[PDB]
Amino acid sequence: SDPSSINGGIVVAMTGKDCVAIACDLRLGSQSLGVSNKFEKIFHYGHVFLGITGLATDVTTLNEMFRYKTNLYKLKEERAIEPETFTQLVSSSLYERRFGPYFVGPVVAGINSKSGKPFIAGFDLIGCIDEAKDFIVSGTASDQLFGMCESLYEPNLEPEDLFETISQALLNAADRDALSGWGAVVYIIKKDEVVKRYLKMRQD
Amino acid sequence: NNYDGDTVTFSPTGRLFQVEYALEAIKQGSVTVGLRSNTHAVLVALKRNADELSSYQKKIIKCDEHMGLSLAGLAPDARVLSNYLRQQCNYSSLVFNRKLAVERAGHLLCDKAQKNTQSYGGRPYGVGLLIIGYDKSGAHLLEFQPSGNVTELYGTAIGARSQGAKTYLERTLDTFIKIDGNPDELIKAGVEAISQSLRDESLTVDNLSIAIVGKDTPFTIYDGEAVAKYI
Amino acid sequence: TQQPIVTGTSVISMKYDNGVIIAADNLGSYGSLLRFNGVERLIPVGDNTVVGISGDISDMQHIERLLKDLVTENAYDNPLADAEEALEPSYIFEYLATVMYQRRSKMNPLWNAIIVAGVQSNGDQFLRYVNLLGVTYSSPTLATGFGAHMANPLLRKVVDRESDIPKTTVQVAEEAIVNAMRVLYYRDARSSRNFSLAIIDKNTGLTFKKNLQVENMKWDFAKDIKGYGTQKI
Amino acid sequence: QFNPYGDNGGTILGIAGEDFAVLAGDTRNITDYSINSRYEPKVFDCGDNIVMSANGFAADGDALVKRFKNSVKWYHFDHNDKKLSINSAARNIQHLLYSRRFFPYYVYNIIAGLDEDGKGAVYSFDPVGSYQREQCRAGGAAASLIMPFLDNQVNFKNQYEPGTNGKVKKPLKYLSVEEVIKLVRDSFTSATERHIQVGDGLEILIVTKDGVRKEFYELKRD
Amino acid sequence: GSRRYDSRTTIFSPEGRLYQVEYALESISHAGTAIGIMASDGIVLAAERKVTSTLLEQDTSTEKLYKLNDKIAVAVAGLTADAEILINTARIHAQNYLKTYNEDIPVEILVRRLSDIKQGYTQHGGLRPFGVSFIYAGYDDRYGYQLYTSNPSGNYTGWKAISVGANTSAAQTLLQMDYKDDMKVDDAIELALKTLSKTTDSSALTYDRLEFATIRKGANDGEVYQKIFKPQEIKDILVKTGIT
Amino acid sequence: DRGVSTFSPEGRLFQVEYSLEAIKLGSTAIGIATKEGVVLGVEKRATSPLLESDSIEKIVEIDRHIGCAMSGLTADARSMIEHARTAAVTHNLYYDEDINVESLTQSVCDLALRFGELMSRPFGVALLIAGHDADDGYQLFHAEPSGTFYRYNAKAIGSGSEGAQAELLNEWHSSLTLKEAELLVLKILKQVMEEKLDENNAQLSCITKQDGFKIYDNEKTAELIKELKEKEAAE
Amino acid sequence: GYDRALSIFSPDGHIFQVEYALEAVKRGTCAVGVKGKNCVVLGCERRSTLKLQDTRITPSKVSKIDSHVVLSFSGLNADSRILIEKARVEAQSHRLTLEDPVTVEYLTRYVAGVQQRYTQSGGVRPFGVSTLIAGFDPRDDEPKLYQTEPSGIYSSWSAQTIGRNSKTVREFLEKNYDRKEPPATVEECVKLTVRSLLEVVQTGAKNIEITVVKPDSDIVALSSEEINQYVTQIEQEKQE
Amino acid sequence: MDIILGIRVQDSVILASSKAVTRGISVLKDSDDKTRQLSPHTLMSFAGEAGDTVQFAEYIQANIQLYSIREDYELSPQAVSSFVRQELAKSIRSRRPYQVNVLIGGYDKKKNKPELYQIDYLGTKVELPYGAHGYSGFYTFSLLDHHYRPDMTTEEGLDLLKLCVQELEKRMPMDFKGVIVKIVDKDGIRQVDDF
Amino acid sequence: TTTLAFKFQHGVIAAVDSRASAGSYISALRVNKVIEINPYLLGTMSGCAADCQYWERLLAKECRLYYLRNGERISVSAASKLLSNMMCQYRGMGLSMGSMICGWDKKGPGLYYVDEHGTRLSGNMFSTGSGNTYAYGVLDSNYKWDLSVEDALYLGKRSILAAAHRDAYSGGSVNLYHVTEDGWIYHGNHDVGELFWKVKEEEGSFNNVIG
Ligand SMILES: *[B]([O])([O])[C]([C][C]([C])[C])[N]C(=O)[C]([C]C1=[C][C]=[C][C]=[C]1)[N]C(=O)C1=[C]N=[C][C]=N1
Ligand SMILES: [Mg+2]
Ligand SMILES: [Mg+2]
Ligand SMILES: [Mg+2]
């Protein structure tokens, strides 16, 4: 019944030293039934990364919408959109459906190409921006993720250390959530290289 | 000349030529006569045929049990205006349980025709109407011009050669007004009036059209052998 | 859809030999609070019609304005506005009935019960009812609200059918109406002692009586009533 | 919450003869346990030798009759004063009723007159516009009281011929106007006895080739 | 009324021509020449900027060559403002298609859509047509490399090599002479510049008076790259081909 | 330029008068009404011998009891026929009966003057509407783009109309049979047509109470043409 | 909205805008339609003023409206796309609501109706296009060939041509086409269609397009070489 | 309606759909084909609320057929599935949504690969080796998870499908009156007339 | 209500009961639940009488207009679809209509079931209404394609009788129709009271009931 917990799923993002990380589980379900173990929830538009949790049809719809808008942005501006600017675009787009909203929990992550500054942001389903310094969490195991992140996280972690921290935050949160899991992906993002890693986890 | 291209243009002398041209269509139309007493009101109309194989175009239209009219000019425009009268008569009955006064019916026709004379795109109505009726203030006869001008009269005539019938009624004024409680004699006066506008042709059985309304007489139209009595 | 706020109670009326009588009290109630004591609920239209209204007062005032505008509109381009083409009771009623039924059909009613009393051009008595549902009916006696339950029985003893109308005089009819208003004051908790009464006669015209009071009341027997059963003191 | 509907009681009865038709109805109008009027006409002459009655919610009933009377008027205007036949009137009324399919006229409607062969005709309608020609129909409050009696006394249902014992039916002999009026009066007298919303008066409209005639009879006023 | 002042932009002449379309084409014949040449391994778009100034900021300027998406580009001849209205509509159409089908829009489908918009202004609405002619250079996986043109009438056709704007008669003759089917991009680059150099109304063809672009599969492995040439890169290719 | 709904100084609508000129250029259509039925006949007038003449549909059914023939800009007639068919069937839906021929004709004519600046111009086609009803019997109407309609005992429209009408003036009487009317239409069509009349370039039809509206076969018409030739050679 | 009456009557009873639309058709490239005993062939002229054309991607002159019906035209190319799109939409709309594909006559009647509508609607001009619509009705082996024009009139033809110099090729068809015995085979029908275009075309190279439509949705377009063989055989018989 | 299954094997896609249609307490039909051919190499099966299913399917069919005629080209299964998804995502926020779940089985002639897409009435799309809607997956997925290989033949796919139907027929309370099976491959669409 | 229709060798049979109810009260003994759309088309009725009458008489309007435009009679398939599309517009608005469109066209006999949801099903045999389960029992055990017109008429008649007996909201009388390639043929009104006793004696059935 609750649109935000029909399909299940989670997303988490973290900042590090001259880097950011964003990770998600791979489950898509119909309440108790697991349907897909390849439903990735992280997308990217140039160097800006967007993770979306919640109702799967809206996840897909919003990805297609932001691809649409960022491609036009680039044609007109003659440059790729930056994380700070994209964050405002997400907020604007969600609030235009104030009284008929997309049932989603978006998360933005990336590095500004000019300043080199790491950036993350989270939103509620209607556009409110949470621009955190440390981490952002979203999904059906957000309570679990808050507990993991708040204890495991420390500032200025190196990319390969940040990977371990965010991976363990996701994995152990997902293993205490019935509607999350069935695989996981982690993106490690630096100013001009991005690595993508699929994690091995329990498949129940 | 340069000021007759549309209805929205006054001439330098303050004339509206499109309205005047619409008035001209009435003069080309077949003659019709209207007259009344204190008890009854009568319409008499000379119907026109296309040829010997054709029927004679109907001239008189019923609007309500107590009201109707005769036409001269563009017949489709008379159908539009009579349809409007039917609706207005009917609105009065359904909403107010009230028969529509003939004078108010004239005011409504005036205002409807006027809107077509002041706006761009449209055109004036190309027909003249003679409305008869019996209401709470007795018998009535109205003359409608598509300029918007509506006039209450004892008697009148419109159409081709209508001046002959109009002069006759102007002489007979004192006589026919007194024909109270005698429908046949009032019709006779109307048939004699319309006869003053005839040339070459005469009143035959499928040529003549008569209508009457009065104190205890609903608006009824007489055609065919029903008017042979008056020929 | 709404709810009535400030309300007026019964309107009562009856036919007699030469015309009609209609009456209604001067109260505007606010639930159980008897808020407004100077409200006129009989509204004359010309010199041949009186419209009596019960129910929501804000809607009554709206109807009052429609009738006032109806008189203004009828006079337009009408040389016989004060003669043959004056407003008739039947015209006024049919107009209101049309409005009431249209408003109920849009699910936004005028929350009223209305009685139109008057005399026609030919001298015929007119008395017809209409309410928020657009329901209409006519009878020798008519009453709204509590009046329907208490007044009608009393008034029907005077005029039980159509043939009793010519046998009923204006003195007898007014006496019955005034008695009914007293009975309603005894028994209706949303009534007042002060009321208005209107007579429309085919000979003497419209007589509008204001500031009438219920009088000749029986209360003395109350002194002997003690307790609710066994109490003697 | 505002309820746009109400119940004004009343009962109506239509019977089709061989060369005539009757449409009867009581004259009592009510709400709940009160009488509004002892004489409020419910059966109307609509012109063209057609009679009509819309029983149920009086406001919707008056509106429908008013609109049909209007439809007859415009039928004359549009089709050269042609007489509206009873079958054509019936089909027209269906479309008047179904225009408010999603906010219906709350009435059971009956019309009566003569068909195009001069025979008696009665048509019966439900609130949403289903209709059908019938020989006999009671409508309204006491409809369930009256119809069985008419099945028995008009169509001779469950009646057989003495001596045969169920083998031969009672033959369906035609009824005169005097005979039909007797059955109408007894139907309403019986309905008045057992139904509180029926009483005060009975008004009958009789339709023949000569026109529309009226008859009135007193009913019990309690 | 208003009828008095109506030019009636959407009517036939007695000969069966559309007045405004013909006059719009007359306008376009005075615009800077744009050339498109299709090769087996890519497409070339070359175009001449109209009598420029030394104080014009060229590196940030764009009047001829526009990007519709990553696979499709256009060369413009006519009113630039009119072209930008249509260009933005085409960019939206391409994105609508991509959102609906999750595939890049086939070149012809985009061309047909823009050409239908142009057609509409010639048949209804009472408005003047767009005074623009496009050369579409694009790639998809059905027909590969494609060149199209559209004009104010809304009519469009496919080409191996084509010119629009000024001196198209002379330009088309030169292209028809030297073009061959087995031609390559580097050769087509040379043909385009040589044709402009001969047809130009200017005294000499220089880098500051040109806009240039290529669409190549010369992108690392099975994919397509759009290259809008920079002022310095146009200057280099002019020296390479031996024009300056 | 000038308004589409403009009156001339003589009191006529320019556009209506000009549409009448287009109708004069149309192929001939003739209608004759009798007490046994109404006959409708038309000139097909194929522009080329390769044009399959049976695809030329200038006589049309509106209802079982109403037929229609056309002359002028025949493409304009299609929406008029569509309205007529809809009006006829809709009335049957509302009133469980056939619609009167006059009422049908009036409904078609109500479209006529719905033009201005609704459609942009009047219709450029005239219609002969023939039918039967119980009230007024066999009827023939001429529906013009002016919105006017006249009833006729016999009527011709199109290019050879005034010549045909003069011929119909002399030939028509109130005791004509259906067979006599059929031959009379064929006779007058043959007189005004450019090409020689045969079963392929001319078409007949009729409306009777019993059988309703029927378009005649080319074989049936061919026999009536042969019957016509012999009776003209008989004196 | 723009409501201006562009198509109006003139004093002599002509609608000039509709007549000028026919002049646009006269300017268009020649199109021809010939129906045999068991097929219909549509021939189309391609003007050779335009070389360096890409014939793979250039809009073809013959368009499929459905799997069993085709449409060719003469006149304004841009105008023809609007009629084709509407026709294609109506074809699918008919299948969806009636569960049968359109008949050739029905599709023609619809396209002709659209053309007519644009001659008495405000703010629009007539289509400068005449069409040839051909095909076979579902579960029918009788060939169908219709023609439409800007005014909105339509009719069936044993053989017909439209466009520039159509007067000449119609002259040819009128003397060469026999109704009692139409082209019995596909070869004879194509040969007669190519012959008719050779009266007008110029060179028989890439200037002639041929599309054969057979019953039961069997539609194919001939290639350059296949047509060139007809062109070769015709002239070799002519040298005598 | 009730049951729709799909399986993508080596060189084809197999769709199985139940034959039953029930009105009230009565089974009106036991031979209903819950499928529509969208294009020569694309088949869509459907299940959901009465009426909406066929209406939606035929509407999609008309749109794809219109595209095919306009471009003289067959859309890829992926492109068709995205079009269908958008229509359902559009529909879910409408005044009255179309309550329809679909499986789209297609053979991509360009890539020479079979493809199966599962889309629910919300517009939730997933590409799968095998799929189902409603309760069907609850009974069948354990068998498919165990036995499925990507290199299976069409015949092996049918045998695994028979095992799924047998399990459904054993453990489902509802009688769905067997299934119609159709195969989508490089040669087009064909029906298995004996199952 | 009980209606049935089935295809067979010599066309299609259509049979219906005649009862109409308002709660427990039997409001009509003799309603006509079959509409004669045209000489080759029939439509049955179950559900709300107003909806059945209005929308099927509106269907006949549309089928007549089809004949005038095309000069050809409409197919059973096309007619059934027009009706199902009407239902789809008022989808959810509360209409109540269950009907079978019976006829003979170029493909031979045709039979389609249509309901208020927009459902449209082609088939050999259907039955609708409160008493359809009883009719199906008799139909399923006795139906063959090899039936004669006489036996087929009796089967449909006997099937309605079965339902009229057991179902409280079915009864009154049986209306029979037989659709051929030369058009439908009415086979009369049959009172259930008289038919029940007649069938009981001649067939020997309904032993449980005393007569
Ligand atoms: B039948 O029962 O479906 C019948 C068919 C209709 C065409 C006459 N309907 C009814 O009897 C319904 C009630 C009903 C009973 C059982 C199932 C479904 C519906 N009654 C009416 O339609 C009706 C209409 N007007 C007056 C009385 N009853
Ligand atoms: Mg688990
Ligand atoms: Mg009683
Ligand atoms: Mg029973």
Q: What is the CATH classification number for the domain harbouring G211?
A: 3.60.20.10
Phi, psi of E108 (to 5 degrees): -60, -40
Which range marks the domain in which residue C98 is found? 1-233
D40: chain C residues, CB-CB within 8 Å: 137-139
Q: Which atom of ligand 1 is nearest to the CA of I33?
A: 7
Contact F95 D80 (CB under 8 A): no
Ligand 1 contact, I24 CB (< 6 A): no
Query: How many helices and strands in chain I, by DSSP H and E?
Result: 5, 13
Contact predicate A138/A11, CB 8 Å = yes
Q: How far apart are CA I135 and CA I157, in angstroms?
A: 10
| SS3 category, E43 | strand
Q: Is the CB of D126 under 6 A from ligand 1?
A: yes
Q: Is B86 helix (H, G, I), strand (E, B) or coil?
A: helix
Helix pair angle (F77-95, G104-117), 10° resolution = 110
Evaluate whether chains A and C are touching (3 or more beta carbon pairs less than 8 Å apart).
no
Interface test with A, best of E60, E68, E95, E226 (most A CBs within 10 A): E95
The superfamily in CATH containing domain F1-235 is: Aminohydrolase, N-terminal nucleophile (Ntn) domain (3.60.20.10)
Select from G141, G160, G161 the least CA-distant residue to G29: G161
Does F103 contact D80 at a Cβ distance shorter than 8 Å? yes
Strand, helix or coil at C144?
A: coil
Per-residue DSSP letter, A4 = G
Per-residue buried b or exposed e for F70-106, using 16+ beta carbons within 10 Å of the residue's own CB:
bbbbbbbbbbbbebbbebbbebbbbbbbbbbbbbbbb
Are H92 and A57 a contacting pair at CB < 8 A? yes
Contacts of E176 in chain G (CB under 8 A): 51-52
Ligand nearest the Cα atom of residue D128: 1
Q: How far apart are CA E197 and CA G76, in angstroms?
A: 35
Q: Collapsing DSSP states into helix, strand and coil, what is residue D222?
A: coil
What is the residue range of B77's domain? 1-231
CB I44 within 8 Å of CB I56: no
Q: How far is it, in rounded angstroms, from Cα I182 to Cα I40?
A: 7
Q: Which residues share a beta bridge with A184?
A: A25, A199
**Where is chain I discontinuous (C–N over 2.5 Å), named by the preceding residue?**
none
Nearest to H86 by CA among B105, B138, E165, A60: A60
User: Nearest ligand, CA of residue D190?
Assistant: 3
Could you give the angle at the alpha carbon of C141 between the alpha carbons of C135 and C143, nearest 5°?
A: 55
Structural domains of chain H, with CATH: 1-195 (3.60.20.10)
D210: number of Cβ within 10 Å: 9
Residues 6+ apart with CB under 8 A from G38: G141, G143, G186, G214, G215
Question: What is the rounded distance in angstroms from the CA atom of residue A91 to the CA atom of residue A126?
Answer: 7
Residues I34, I185: Cα–Cα separation, whole Å: 12
Q: SS3 string of chain G?
A: CCCCCCCCECCCCCEHHHHHHHHHHHHCCCEEEEECCCCEEEEEECCCCCCCECCCCCCCCCEECCCCEEEEEEECHHHHHHHHHHHHHHHHHHHHHHCCCCCHHHHHHHHHHHHHHCCCCCCECCCCEEEEEEECCCCCCCCEEEEECCCCCEEEECEEEECCCHHHHHHHHHHHCCCCCCCCCHHHHHHHHHHHHHCCCCCCCCCEEEEEEECCCEEEECCHHHHHHHHHHHHHHHCC
d(CA G22, CA G12) in angstroms, rounded, equals 18
Q: Span A1-204: which CATH code?
A: 3.60.20.10
Contact flag C135-D58 (C-beta cutoff 8 Å) = yes
Query: Tokens 């020296």 correspond to what residue?
Result: E239
Return the residue of E nearest to F2 by Cα: E3
Distance CA B190, CA B200 (A): 19
Determine the Cα–Cα distance for residues D126 and D73; give it in Å rounded to an integer: 24
Q: Strands (DSSP E) along C57-184, which ranges?
A: 112-119, 125-131, 136-138, 141-143
- Return the ligand 1 atom nearest residue D127 CA: 25
Q: Identify the H or E element spanning E26.
A: helix E19-28
Cβ A148 vs Cβ A168: under 8 Å: yes
**Other CB atoms within 10 Å distance of the CB of residue F163:** 14
Chain C hits for B107, CB-CB cut-off 8 Å, are: 77
Task: Report domain extents, chain A.
Answer: 1-204
Query: With contact defined as beta carbons under 8 Å apart, do E148 and E156 qualify?
Result: yes
The answer for residues whose C-beta is within 8 angstroms of residue C9's C-beta and 6 or more apart is C25, C27, C29, C54, C145, C146, C147, C184, C188, C190, C191
Query: From CA B150, how far away is CA B143, in angstroms rounded?
Result: 6
**Ligand 1 atom nearest I27 alpha carbon:** 27
Angle (CA) E114-E118-E119 rounded to 5° is 115
Residue spans of beta strands (DSSP E) within chain E: 34-39, 42-48, 65-67, 72-78, 132-140, 144-150, 156-159, 161-164, 210-216, 225-228
Tell me which residue has tokens 């002619």. E133
d(CA D79, CA F133): 12
Cα H92 from Cα E112, distance rounded (Å): 32
The count of domains in chain B is 1
Q: Is I27 in the pocket of ligand 1 (CB under 6 A)?
A: yes
Closest protein CA for atom 5 of ligand 1: I46
Question: Residue E135, Cβ neighbours under 10 Å: how many?
Answer: 28
Q: Cβ–Cβ contacts within 10 Å for residue D12, how many?
A: 27
**DSSP state at residue I176:** E
Which residues, 6 or more positions from D187, have their beta carbon under 8 angstroms from its beta carbon?
A: D13, D138, D146, D149, D150
The two most distant CA atoms of chain F are separated, in Å, by 60
Residue (of G53, G71, G38) closest to G190 by Cα position: G38
The architecture (CATH level 2) of D1-222 comes to 4-Layer Sandwich (3.60)
CA F107 from chain centre, in angstroms, equals: 16
CA dist E140 and G57 (Å) reads 12
β-pair type (H12-18, H4-8): antiparallel
Q: Which domain holds residue G179?
A: 1-240
The 8 Å CB, 24+ separation contacts for B192-195 are B192/B168, B193/B33, B193/B35, B193/B44, B193/B155, B193/B157, B193/B165, B193/B168, B193/B169, B194/B31, B194/B32, B194/B33, B194/B44, B194/B45, B194/B46, B194/B157, B194/B165
Q: Which of F207, F107, F73, F144 is nearest to B50 (CA)?
A: F144
* Extended strands (E) in chain C: 6-8, 11-16, 19-25, 28-30, 33-36, 42-44, 49-56, 112-119, 125-131, 136-138, 141-143, 194-201, 205-213
Rounded CA separation G136/G146 (Å): 11
The 8-class DSSP code of residue B178 comes to T
- For helices B183-194 and B162-176, the axis angle rounded to 10 degrees is 150
- D66 contact B CB<8A: yes
CB G132 within 8 A of CB G27: no
Tokens 């028995």 belong to residue: D152
- Resolution attained, angstroms: 2.5
Please, which chains are in contact with I (at least 3 CB pairs closer than 8 A)?
Answer: D, F, G, H
I49 CB within 6 A, ligand 1: yes
Half-sphere exposure (CA, 13 Å, Cβ side) for A191? 8
**Cα diameter, chain H:** 48
* Residue C156, helix vs strand vs coil: helix
Interatomic CA distance for residues G183 and G192, integer angstroms: 8
**Can you give the length of chain H in residues?**
195
User: Which residues of I fall within a CB distance of 8 Å from G106?
Assistant: 70
Cα–Cα distance for residue pair D54/D63, rounded to 1 Å: 9
On whether any CB of chain D is under 8 Å from the CB of I52, the answer is yes
SS (H, E, C) I130-143: CCHHHHHHHHHHHC
Measured distance CA(I20)–CA(E132) in Å, rounded:
72
> Where does residue B28 rank: exposed (0-12), middle (13-18), buried (19+ CB within 10 A)?
middle
Tell me how the structure was determined.
Answer: X-ray
- For strand H4-8 and strand C141-143, is the pairing parallel, antiparallel, or unpaired? unpaired
> In angstroms, what separates the C-alpha of B79 from chain F's closest C-alpha?
9
Identity of residue G136: F
Closest CA to A60 of A100, A28, A34: A28
D142 burial level (CB within 10 Å; 0-12, 13-18, 19+): buried
User: If DSSP codes are grouped into helix, strand and coil, which group holds residue H71?
Assistant: helix
Could you give phi then psi for residue D68, rounded to 5 degrees? -70, -45
d(CA C73, CA H134): 68
Respond yes or no: is residue I180 known to be catalytic.
no
Task: Please name the helix (run of DSSP H) or strand (run of DSSP E) that holds residue C74, with its range, or none.
Answer: helix C57-75
Residue I185 near ligand 1, beta carbon < 6 Å? no
Name the residue type at position C225: I
Q: Name the domain count of chain G.
A: 1
Cα(D196) to centroid(ligand 3), Å: 4
Given a contact cutoff of 8 angstroms between Cβ atoms, the answer to whether D215 and D180 are in contact is: no
Contact state of F89 with I58 under an 8 Å Cβ cutoff: no
Collect all residues of chain E within an 8 Å Cβ-Cβ radius of residue B6: 1
| Count: domains in chain I | 1
- Give the Cα separation of D34 and E197 in Å (integer): 104
State the Cα–Cα distance between residues G129 and B205, nearest whole angstrom: 56
Contacts of E95 in chain A (CB under 8 A): 68, 71-72
Token pair listed for I59: 């269907």
Question: Which of A65, A67, A72 is closest, CB to CB, to E91?
Answer: A72
Q: How many residues does chain E have?
A: 244
Interface contact flag, D2 C134, Cβ < 8 Å: no
Return the structure tokens found at G235.
């002239």
Q: CA angle, E51 as apex, E45 and E56 as ends, to 5°?
A: 90
With tokens 């051009």, the residue in question is C121
Interface-testing mutation among I62, I68, I70, with chain G (most G C-beta atoms within 10 A): I70
Tokens read off for B46: 């000379």
Bridge-partner residues for F8, per DSSP?
Answer: none
Rounded CA gap, C95 and C67, in Å? Answer: 9
Location of structure tokens 């919707």: D60
Tokens representing F130 are 């023939």
CA angle (A198, A203, A204) in 5-degree steps:
145
> D64 and D56 in contact (C-beta within 8 Å)?
no
- Tokens 């039917």 appear where? B86
Side chain identity, residue H52? D
Contact B94 D77 (CB under 8 A): no
F229: Cβ contacts below 8 Å, ≥ 6 apart: none
Work out the angle between the directed axes of helices E185-199 and E168-178 (0-180°, nearest 10): 140
d(C-alpha G161, C-alpha C51), whole Å: 82
Residue G171 to residues F48, G41, G161: CA-CA distances in angstroms? 10, 18, 10
CATH code (residue I92):
3.60.20.10
The distance of H133 to chain E (nearest Cα, Å) reads 23
Cite the DSSP H helix spans in B49-141.
75-96, 102-118
What is the amino acid identity at position E222?
Answer: G
DSSP structure string for H92-121:
HTSSS---EEEEEEEEETTTTEEEEEEE-T
Residue written as token pair 């008493």 = I131
Residue I98 CA: which ligand 1 atom is closest?
Answer: 3
- G and F interact (at least 3 Cβ pairs within 8 A): yes
Biggest CA–CA distance in chain B, Å, is: 55
Angle at which helices C89-105 and B75-96 pack, to 10 degrees? 90
How far is Cα of residue I59 from the mean position of the Cα atoms in its chain?
Answer: 16
Beta bridge mates, C114? C53, C130
Sign of the four-CA dihedral A133, A137, A143, A147: negative
Cβ partners under 8 Å of residue G170, min gap 6: F48, F50, G160, G161
Asked if residues H108 and E103 have their Cβ atoms less than 8 Å apart, the reply is no
Confirm if I158 and I138 have CB atoms less than 8 A apart: yes
**Cα gap I85→F166, rounded to integer Å:** 54
Strands I41-44 and I97-105: antiparallel
> In whole angstroms, what is the distance from residue E73 CA to residue E60 CA?
18
- DSSP-derived secondary structure for E95-164: HHHHHHHSSPPPHHHHHHHHHHHHHHHHHBSSPPPP-EEEEEEEEETTTEEEEEEE-TT--EEEESEEEE
Does ligand 1 come within 6 angstroms of the Cβ of I26? no
Reference I9, options I122, I105, I103, I148; nearest CA is: I148
Q: Which domains does chain E have, with CATH numbers?
A: 1-244 (3.60.20.10)
Token pair 């044709």 in the structure block, residue = E195
Is the CB–ligand 1 distance for residue I31 below 6 Å? yes
What domain range includes position I16? 1-211
Q: How many CB atoms lie within 10 A of CB E180?
A: 10
Distance separating alpha carbons of residues F108 and F81, to the nearest angstrom: 8
CB within 8 Å of F231: residues ≥ 6 apart: F183
| Dihedral over Cα of I146, I150, I153, I159: its sign | negative
Phi, psi of D134 (to 5 degrees): -140, 160
H45 pairs with which residues across the strands?
A: H35, H103
Q: Give the helix/strand (H/E) hosting A174.
A: helix A159-174
User: Is the Cβ pair D36, C137 closer than 8 Å?
Assistant: yes
Please tell me the total count of domains within chain C: 1
E95-to-D102, E66, E68 alpha-carbon distances in Å: 43, 16, 10
